[PDB]
Design a protein around this ligand. Structure first.
Ligand SMILES: O=C(NC1CCCC1)[C@@H]1CCCCOc2cccc(c2)C[C@H](N2CCCC2=O)C(=O)N[C@@H](CCN2CCOCC2)C(=O)N1
Lengths: 216, 241, 202, 222, 232, 201, 212, 235, 237
């Protein structure tokens, strides 16, 4: 992909005590045009792993297809081994790096959330093959607008509860709606716990416009 | 007499003896049976245990070739594993190209043609395995197919491959499987496998059970352990009396 | 170009304008942009004529062979998937926005957008081509659930008429096709049959 | 270049001018732009002359093989499919714009084929640098199901519009009339332009040119 | 599989390529064919007996056009002949594409014979089991050629192939004459076929093609019917 | 970089500076610019450090293989030809190498200049690198075929010293080698600060 | 599309008589943002060898994985672990293999040679490399190197007793130079990971740096 | 004969071609390697076939690298490819790792070629048959002196003392009778020459044998005629 | 006979004689035993010396930190397969950053070694493998054969006279799960000793051991490193 066509905006992720939460708005933008307003940019990879993607949506659909087939192929063996979130993150890092090295990149930034062996995993992979782990993550404009809030909270409180993390991501999504011109007030929250992966569907943030009257 | 050394040579009677020899290899294997019922398909296999040194579950002859498709094999196990890999590749490629689960009939046809391609040349030899494919879907119902070394594929209500296929078929024909559930059919399958098993020649064996149907929501899987224990108890009770 | 498809209970309604331009010259003014891919599966093409013609022909071939092999009517989703695979694999060489609309017995009437770049999404209704930009608001204001086939035909005709009035790259006649279980009913609105909206004066 | 075609009641009429230029200089005054494809199928060509010639020759030979094997008259749709798939394969680098016309078992058929491999099936078509003038003539005067003579006059007027209003078109008008019962290749159909009479005589008399060396090699004849 | 890379046709201690001789035995067991080169054309005739009346005799032709001016017929194996006909048509078209001129008959014969030779030396194939009679008209002249399974070709004034071809050649020697016209050549060809024909000949029992200035064409059953009525 | 080499009555002298830079930043002052291919054969490096190092190491490998196959050391001319053919394959791709191959073979002393631009020439004196013009001046004014060994050492040291004085991209230490009939010897390594002290009172 | 991005990172290595220190900052940045504060640039290769890599993080990750694989393959084929010098030579060849689409990585290897003495090898992106007593690489290398020249190499100092560098003094110097770098190089900061290689093994230490 | 492919197993589980190639080894001239603490000594009977032949052109001991030599027995022409592979291997190792390859690693790399022959699914350049030569690699690496034996089957083993070739039976029995782990290099050289003199047919002299040594100090060294004369005089 | 020269020729009995001959190749090799407890997997290999002056041929090889193998049969085929296995484990660690599970490695070996058994001119691999591994499912002993079949075993023995070892293992397998490492190795050594003739005896020269476990990377013990395990061994009957 030399030129991304339909793209998704920021994806947020936060670790919490006993799981991980990821948030993404449900919009595919065609340049400035909010063309496709009900697309899911979060995928359940398996019972312990979920994946959210910003960037080119067709590249995301391709990656979702390939990952789904890999997970199916592994589940067929029935040998008691399953891909951990870390293994999926490593595989995605390799795939992105290989495509970048061919000068034919997959134009996506991905947040991989997971919960295995009583430990939370939150990984970042960008289109050049830059990957890492962190307590909190935000792609695109989120990196400038959401990440400071997440990191302030986590710096003063390293371990969050699920409720605390959920409130945090809601606040970040509201800020993104206020300030990201490619945002949309309809988003999904995916949570991975020991219980599995649960994707909560169309949500909206309450907004305040009182400053609109504060005009002179 | 020289006519039976290559699959690319017809005998003067129009037979291909290498394919018949591969079929003999299939015939010298422990039996497997598939039964199609109203709700799905049940597979049973008489896995002969050639030594107590082996871990239980070694050399499984039931495979998952797709979420919705199970496969039971008889004959050369390595050839069977190769064909299972081929079937898995076919299902995965079909999902990649057309975006939905491969219909069982189409998968059976594709794998049967792959098998057939090995019956025409001196460069390769025919596969030495027969196998059944079972699936259940809401739209298609329950489907059971069998493929043999010649590449012939047919749909069945009840199928037996292996060395005791004829006796197993005689037993299967006594069931009215068209109006039965998977829950009773698993017991009947265990009973048939126990009946046809040769206690003297074959020594010990493990019963392998799998199924795919409404009760599994279209997913092929090994029969749960309690279900298998009940089925084996029923089969032994049927044998003893 | 302006193309549109809308789902209704039991089928789909497709529509297109008939203008094909090279620069500002109208090379063809009665183009047929609704292409039958199969008995009850159509595609509306926008973008490069050569690319969409080639891709639609390739998909028609692949889908016909697939349907013969399976002995069953193809799924609309299968045709959309074939289109998607071709449009994604060659996204750097193709300029093709496709709408695949049809009817199949399993999922009824379906509309899928395969825009430039090769993503695929199912939609209650889809619009595309250069002129669609001018009717987004209109469709968003006028669409409602539970529209009958007649209402969907009128809705598509109105939307295409507005797009054609504003978009220099659209015009000509409106080609409509309704697809249901019973089959495909095609029609052409031309001249005074095209919905009219008065130009404001003074 | 101006080429055009129309479908009339019983067949096709194709037309072309006969000028070929290099830059802004006339190279050929009598270029033949209507190309044989099969006895019932012809093709006018604009764009790159070598590309048009080679593409039409190739498709004509392939269609000849196809007809030899089938033992049936070729179909226009077959010619169109072969041409368009080849042109698309070459991604517009074969600069052949074509007007393909024929009569087969399913009646008369007229296609316009563009260099990138797009095609249009239409009752009348124009191509070349003079295409717009000819198309103006058609839009003004075309009617469905014209008689043969009306169609001939219409196509001739269209080519004449191209000849007299486009610097890239000129010289003669060639027509090709195709019906199920005949083919009339009219070359030239009209000669609207002619070189003026030479007022003076500039005849170089013998001995006017000075010669340094001369060599006469006798040739043995049968 | 990939094909065998070694030749199935090899030299015997006596210096013979026995597979070629066996392919020639197959040819000699084929249905009789006759070619006659007249002053103003060439006639190819061949027995076309069907096994039963159930066969749609007008569905498969033994006399085939290669180009407007070149036709051919065969003795031997039909499917091999179809292969060679397809190759010959392709070769003629390639020649036309390069030279923008109908391929001369001799050139077409040389190219087809080259293919046939290739099948006597390449790996893992047998020779073609057919002999071809190729008729053509170019440079205001008729041409009659025969091409054998070995890839050797000869120019003939008249010849016979297939079952009973030695008697046919003697008959042609007795009857043939360089000065005779095309219609007399057709009569002579049909008479040559009659010599080795079983049962009564009809317009549906034999196939005839003619090459002259206009081109090569298969004769219709009505024209053959007229010629047969004249022959009686 | 400044490297020089010259043949004279008593063999071949090879001298180099020891500085390596990345842009304007001095990456190192201790780089070894004289590659010891075998006891009778030396290579010098100028230009891209990675290119010169890699390709002269490849040359050393090929020379060892040649000796094993043919039971004799490769000649200087053959070694330089090997290098030139190796680098010609990458012409115009951005390889930066200016190398002197110096040795003693059956034909006596041998001195070849080989660069990535394709040149391969024998000569009696060469200088390569960004500081080679400055070194040429001094060497040319001081050079005779009949220099004594110590005079030759002094000439090489002074030429490299002056080059490091004028050229911003040359400096560090003068490393000096002498190729004789029975193999080369590392003559010395003198820091140009010490030389500056020596050549100025 | 650019296949490269600069992710910052400052690495340092010091060879002692019987030790080698490899240190790095743990900040991972892009543009003017901080991806993470916990990305150390040092990787243990063998009980005797550590490598520091800075630059384009994608290349750093891929290169470290390739080196790990090569070390295991060498151990398989030769039945012994690679020495530090062998690793340096091999890395030079790996980097040159991409001479026309380079790894955008600066590498410093710190370990023990076969004699048990500290060895530091410094590399450029296309594989040029040399042995040094000390070296800095990455974003703040131009800041670090002159101070090390002055304090480890005693350059420009007269009437100073050139004395062998003890481990304690080396640790203090590493910490001080990284503190100075965190004040002036925007990319350097958030923490200092130090790996000390001795015959006893690899010990690890972490020190806080300023976070702005 | 051609009744079987080159990759056909016998009913006893052995490849026919490998067993035949070992039979071919048993026709080679006798070579003997002895490994001691002070180094490795290789010796080989030259087997001069005519007085018009030049003995110096018979190369049965070749240098693989400064620290590795190889003695060979059997079809010597087949040994050339293996020797070149070993030489290229050591030089590739030096280029990549800036160090000397161990004797075991070189032997392993050579042995990996033994069974790389076959007909079908084989690109041009593929070997049609096994190598008919046995090799004794002597060398000195960090682990001291090392002697390795490789045969046509691709099996290689470290040996203290090994005899290959036609007379390898008696030579091996004598080596077992005489070898002790503490023997010196001079002792090993003398013993190997005694065994060669015993098993050879022509009288052992300085022209009809080859002797090389590898020591931790000196590189691979081929004895000259005068050194050979001195050693032979004390026998 | 006409059926016993190519892998692509089925015999009239439904057998493939070339594969059985490769089985013989394995049955000729020196005995090796594998066994396991709840926490450890052990390979014990009896090594042969071709001559009294030659070193004993190595029978245990490294594949990955968690996987080692013991070979019996043609050693060049063994090296081919070992290199393939090593590359597979390296690929797994490169792509997924995790050790390759042992069963998946065995499946890959099965496919690789089955391919040649069906193609003209190819031969079966002439080596049998015992594979000792440790992964998330615990310890594993696998046996792979020239027929490309593989078995998951509580314990196994392959090579010449391995039937005696199998008899011992069948007798004593009930005790393996609750054995500590030392008792496990001693059981392996007794099983291996059952393969020896009366004259021969287990020493520190002809025995090699390989151990893998939860906190123990695959380690090979040779020469004096075997003495601790041999010290407690009693005298054979
Ligand atoms: O002094 C030097 N040559 C002398 C010393 C030896 C022989 C003579 C050159 C002088 C620079 C000109 C060479 O053009 C390049 C060609 C290809 C690749 C690179 C540079 C890579 C890189 N580039 C590329 C441009 C920006 C940059 O920085 C770079 O300059 N690398 C340094 C490495 C030298 N040291 C580092 C490793 O440790 C040992 C010494 C380098 O090649 N210097």
């Amino acid at each position: 992909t030399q030129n991304p066509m339909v793209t998704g905006t920021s994806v947020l992720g936060v670790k919490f005590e006993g799981g991980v939460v990821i948030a993404a708005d449900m919009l595919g933008s065609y340049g400035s045009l909010a063309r496709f307003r009900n697309i899911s940019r979060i995928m359940r990879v398996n019972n312990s792993t979920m994946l959210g993607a910003s960037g080119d949506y067709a590249d995301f659909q391709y990656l979702k297809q390939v990952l789904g087939q890999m997970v199916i192929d592994e589940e067929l063996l029935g040998d008691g081994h399953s891909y951990s979130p870390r293994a999926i993150h490593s595989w995605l890092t390799r795939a992105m790096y290989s495509r970048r090295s061919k000068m034919n990149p997959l134009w996506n930034t991905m947040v991989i959330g997971g919960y295995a062996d009583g430990e939370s995993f939150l990984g970042y992979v960008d289109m050049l093959g830059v990957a890492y782990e962190a307590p909190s993550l935000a792609t695109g404009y989120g990196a400038y607008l959401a990440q400071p809030l997440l990191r302030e909270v986590l710096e003063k409180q390293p371990v969050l509860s699920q409720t605390e993390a959920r409130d945090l991501v809601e606040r970040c999504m509201r800020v993104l709606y206020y300030r990201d011109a490619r945002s949309y007030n309809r988003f999904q929250i995916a949570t991975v716990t020991e219980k599995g992966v649960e994707i909560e569907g169309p949500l909206s943030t309450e907004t305040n416009w009182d400053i609109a009257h504060m005009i002179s | 007499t020289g006519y039976d050394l290559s699959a690319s040579t017809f005998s003067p009677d129009g037979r291909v003896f290498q394919v018949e020899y591969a079929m003999k290899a299939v015939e010298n294997s422990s039996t497997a049976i598939g039964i199609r019922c109203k709700d799905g398909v049940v597979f049973g296999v008489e896995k002969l245990v050639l030594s107590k040194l082996y871990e239980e579950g070694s050399n499984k002859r039931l495979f998952n070739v797709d979420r919705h498709v199970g496969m039971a094999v008889a004959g050369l196990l390595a050839d069977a594993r190769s064909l299972a890999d081929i079937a898995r590749e076919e299902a995965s490629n079909f999902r990649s190209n057309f975006g939905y689960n491969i219909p069982l009939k189409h998968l059976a046809d594709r794998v049967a043609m792959y098998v057939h391609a090995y019956t025409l040349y001196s460069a390769v030899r025919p596969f030495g395995c027969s196998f059944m494919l079972g699936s259940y879907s809401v739209n298609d119902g329950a489907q059971l197919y069998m493929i043999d070394p010649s590449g012939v594929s047919y749909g069945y209500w009840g199928c037996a491959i292996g060395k005791a296929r004829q006796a197993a078929k005689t037993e299967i024909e006594k069931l009215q499987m068209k109006e039965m559930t998977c829950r009773d059919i698993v017991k009947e399958v265990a009973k048939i496998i126990y009946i046809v098993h040769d206690e003297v020649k074959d020594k010990a064996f493990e019963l392998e059970l799998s199924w795919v149907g409404e009760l599994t929501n279209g997913r092929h899987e090994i029969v749960p352990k309690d279900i298998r224990e009940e089925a084996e108890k029923y089969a032994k009770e049927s044998l003893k009396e | 170009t302006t193309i549109m498809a809308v789902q209704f209970d039991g089928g789909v309604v497709l529509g297109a304008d008939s203008r094909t331009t090279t620069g500002s010259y109208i090379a063809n003014r009665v183009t047929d942009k609704l292409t039958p891919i199969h008995d009850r599966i159509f595609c509306c093409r926008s973008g490069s004529a050569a690319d969409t013609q080639a891709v639609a022909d390739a998909v028609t071939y692949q889908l016909g062979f697939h349907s013969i092999e399976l002995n069953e009517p193809p799924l609309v989703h299968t045709a959309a998937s074939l289109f998607k695979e071709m449009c994604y694999r060659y996204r750097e060489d193709l300029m093709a926005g496709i709408i695949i609309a049809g009817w199949d017995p399993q999922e009824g009437g379906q509309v899928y957008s395969v825009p430039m770049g090769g993503m695929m999404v199912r939609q209650s209704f889809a619009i595309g081509g250069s002129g669609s930009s001018y009717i987004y608001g209109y469709v968003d204001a006028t669409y409602r659930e539970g529209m009958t086939k007649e209402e969907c035909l009128q809705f598509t005709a109105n939307a295409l008429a507005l797009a054609m009035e504003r978009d220099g790259s659209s015009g000509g006649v409106i080609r409509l096709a309704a697809i249901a279980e019973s089959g495909v009913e095609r029609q052409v609105l031309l001249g005074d049959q095209i919905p009219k909206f008065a130009v404001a004066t003074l | 270049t101006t080429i055009a075609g129309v479908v009339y009641k019983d067949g096709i009429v194709l037309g072309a001018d006969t000028r070929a230029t290099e830059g802004m200089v006339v190279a050929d005054k009598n270029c033949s732009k209507i190309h044989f494809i099969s006895p019932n199928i012809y093709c006018c060509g604009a764009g790159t002359a070598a590309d048009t010639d080679m593409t039409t020759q190739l498709i004509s030979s392939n269609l000849e093989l196809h007809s030899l094997s089938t033992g049936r008259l070729p179909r226009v749709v077959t010619a169109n499919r072969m041409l368009k798939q080849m042109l698309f394969r070459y991604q517009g680098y074969i600069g052949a714009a074509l007007v393909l016309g024929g009569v087969d078992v399913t009646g008369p058929h007229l296609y316009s084929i563009y260099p990138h491999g797009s095609t249009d099936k239409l009752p009348y078509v124009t191509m070349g640098s003079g295409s717009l003038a000819a198309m103006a003539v058609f839009e003004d005067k075309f009617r469905p199901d014209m008689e043969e003579e009306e169609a001939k006059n219409l196509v001739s007027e269209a080519i004449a519009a191209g000849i007299f209003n486009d610097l890239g078109s000129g010289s003669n008008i060639d027509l090709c009339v195709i019906s199920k019962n005949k083919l009339d290749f009219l070359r030239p159909y009209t000669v609207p332009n002619k070189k003026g009479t030479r007022l003076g005589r500039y005849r170089c008399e013998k001995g006017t040119t000075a010669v340094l060396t001369e060599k006469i090699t006798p040739l043995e004849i049968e | 599989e990939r094909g065998y890379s070694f030749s199935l046709t090899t030299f015997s201690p006596s210096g013979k390529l026995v597979q070629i001789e066996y392919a020639l035995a197959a040819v000699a067991g084929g249905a009789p064919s006759v070619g006659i080169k007249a002053a103003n054309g060439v006639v190819l005739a061949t027995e076309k007996k069907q096994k039963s009346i159930l066969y749609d005799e007008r569905s498969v032709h033994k006399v085939e056009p290669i180009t407007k001016h070149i036709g051919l017929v065969y003795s031997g194996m039909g499917p091999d002949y179809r292969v060679l006909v397809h190759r010959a048509r392709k070769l003629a078209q390639q020649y036309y594409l390069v030279y923008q001129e109908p391929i001369p008959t001799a050139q077409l014969v040389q190219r087809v014979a080259s293919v046939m030779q290739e099948y006597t030396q390449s790996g893992g194939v047998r020779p073609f089991g057919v002999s071809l009679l190729i008729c053509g008209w170019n440079e205001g002249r008729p041409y009659l050629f025969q091409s054998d399974p070995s890839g050797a070709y000869f120019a003939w004034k008249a010849t016979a192939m297939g079952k009973n071809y030695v008697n046919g050649k003697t008959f042609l020697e007795k009857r043939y004459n360089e000065d005779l016209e095309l219609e007399d050549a057709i009569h002579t060809a049909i008479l040559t076929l009659k010599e080795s024909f079983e049962g009564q000949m009809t317009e549906d029992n034999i196939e005839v093609g003619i090459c002259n200035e206009a081109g090569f064409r298969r004769l219709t059953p009505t024209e053959v019917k007229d010629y047969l009525a004249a022959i009686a | 970089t400044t490297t020089l080499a010259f043949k004279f009555r008593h063999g071949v002298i090879v001298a180099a500076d020891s500085r390596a830079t990345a842009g304007a930043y001095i990456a190192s002052q201790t780089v070894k610019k004289v590659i010891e291919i075998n006891p009778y054969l030396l290579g010098t490096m100028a230009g891209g450090a990675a290119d010169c190092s890699f390709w002269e190491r490849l040359l050393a490998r090929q020379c060892r293989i040649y000796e094993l196959r043919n039971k004799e050391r490769i000649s200087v001319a053959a070694a330089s030809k090997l290098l030139a053919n190796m680098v010609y394959q990458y012409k115009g791709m951005g390889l930066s190498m200016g190398t002197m191959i110096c040795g003693w073979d059956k034909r006596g002393p041998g001195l070849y200049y080989v660069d990535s631009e394709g040149n391969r020439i024998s000569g009696a004196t060469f200088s390569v690198g960004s500081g080679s013009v400055y070194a040429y001046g001094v060497m040319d004014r001081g050079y005779s075929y009949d220099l004594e060994v110590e005079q030759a050492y002094d000439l090489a040291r002074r030429a490299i010293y002056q080059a490091t004085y004028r050229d911003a991209y040359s400096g560090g230490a003068v490393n000096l080698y002498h190729v004789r009939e029975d193999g080369w010897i590392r003559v010395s390594s003198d820091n140009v600060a010490d030389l500056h002290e020596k050549y100025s009172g | 599309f650019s296949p490269y991005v600069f992710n910052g990172g400052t690495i340092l290595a010091i060879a002692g008589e019987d030790f080698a220190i490899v240190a790095s900052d743990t900040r991972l940045s892009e543009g003017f943002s901080i991806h993470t504060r916990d990305s150390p640039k040092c990787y243990k290769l063998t009980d005797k060898t550590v490598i520091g890599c800075s630059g384009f993080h994608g290349d750093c990750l891929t290169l470290t994985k390739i080196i790990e694989a090569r070390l295991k393959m060498y151990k398989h084929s030769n039945n012994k672990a690679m020495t530090t010098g062998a690793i340096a030579a091999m890395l030079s060849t790996i980097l040159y293999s991409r001479r026309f689409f380079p790894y955008y990585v600066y590498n410093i290897i710190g370990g023990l040679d076969e004699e048990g003495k500290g060895a530091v090898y410094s590399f450029d992106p296309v594989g040029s490399y040399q042995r040094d007593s000390f070296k800095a690489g990455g974003s703040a290398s131009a800041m670090l190197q002159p101070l090390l020249d002055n304090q480890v190499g005693f350059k420009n100092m007269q009437n100073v007793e050139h004395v062998p560098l003890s481990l304690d003094r080396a640790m203090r110097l590493v910490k001080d130079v990284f503190i100075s770098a965190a004040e002036r190089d925007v990319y350097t900061g958030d923490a200092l990971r130090i790996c000390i290689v001795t015959k006893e093994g690899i010990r690890e230490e972490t020190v806080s740096l300023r976070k702005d | 004969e051609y009744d079987r492919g080159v990759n056909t197993f016998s009913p006893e589980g052995r490849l026919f071609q490998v067993e035949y190639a070992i039979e071919a080894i048993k026709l080679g001239s006798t070579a003997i390697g002895i490994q001691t603490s002070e180094g490795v000594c290789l010796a080989v009977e030259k087997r001069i076939t005519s007085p018009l032949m030049e003995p110096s052109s018979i190369e049965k001991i070749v240098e693989i690298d400064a620290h590795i030599g190889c003695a060979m027995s059997g079809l010597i022409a087949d040994a050339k490819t293996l020797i070149d592979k070993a030489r290229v291997e050591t030089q590739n190792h030096w280029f990549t790792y800036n160090e000397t390859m161990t004797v075991e690693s070189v032997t392993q790399a050579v042995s990996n070629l033994a069974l790389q022959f076959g007909e079908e699914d084989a690109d041009p350049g593929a070997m049609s048959r096994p190598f008919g030569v046995a090799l004794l690699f002597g060398g000195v690496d960090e682990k001291g002196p090392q002697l390795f034996h490789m045969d046509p089957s691709g099996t290689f083993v470290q040996c203290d003392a090994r005899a290959i070739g036609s007379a390898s039976e008696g030579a091996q029995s004598s080596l077992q009778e005489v070898y002790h782990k503490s023997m010196t290099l001079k002792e090993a050289i003398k013993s190997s020459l005694i065994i060669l003199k015993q098993v050879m047919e022509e009288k052992l002299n300085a022209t009809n044998i080859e002797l090389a040594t590898v020591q931790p100090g000196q590189n691979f060294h081929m004895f000259t005629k005068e050194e050979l004369e001195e050693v032979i005089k004390d026998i | 006979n006409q059926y016993d020269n190519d892998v692509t020729v089925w015999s009239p009995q439904g057998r493939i004689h070339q594969i059985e001959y490769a089985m013989e190749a394995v049955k000729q090799g020196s005995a090796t035993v594998g066994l396991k407890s709840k926490t450890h997997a052990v390979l014990v290999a009896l090594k042969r010396a071709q001559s009294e002056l030659a070193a004993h041929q190595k029978k245990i090889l490294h594949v990955d930190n968690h996987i080692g193998i013991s070979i019996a049969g043609l050693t060049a085929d063994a090296r081919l397969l070992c290199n393939f296995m090593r590359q597979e484990c390296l690929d797994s660690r490169f792509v997924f950053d995790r050790p390759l599970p042992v069963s998946r490695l065995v499946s890959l070996i099965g496919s690789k070694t089955q391919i040649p058994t069906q193609r003209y001119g190819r031969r079966p691999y002439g080596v049998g493998l015992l594979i000792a591994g440790y992964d998330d499912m615990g310890p594993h002993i696998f046996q792979t054969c020239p027929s490309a079949n593989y078995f998951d075993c509580r314990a196994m023995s392959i090579g010449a006279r391995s039937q005696s070892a199998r008899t011992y293992l069948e007798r004593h397998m009930s005790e393996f799960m609750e054995c500590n490492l030392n008792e496990l190795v001693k059981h392996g050594l007794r099983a291996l000793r059952e393969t020896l003739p009366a004259e021969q005896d287990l020493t520190t020269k002809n025995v090699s051991i390989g151990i893998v476990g939860k906190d123990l990377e695959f380690t090979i013990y040779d020469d004096d490193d075997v003495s601790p395990f041999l010290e407690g061994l009693e005298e054979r009957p």
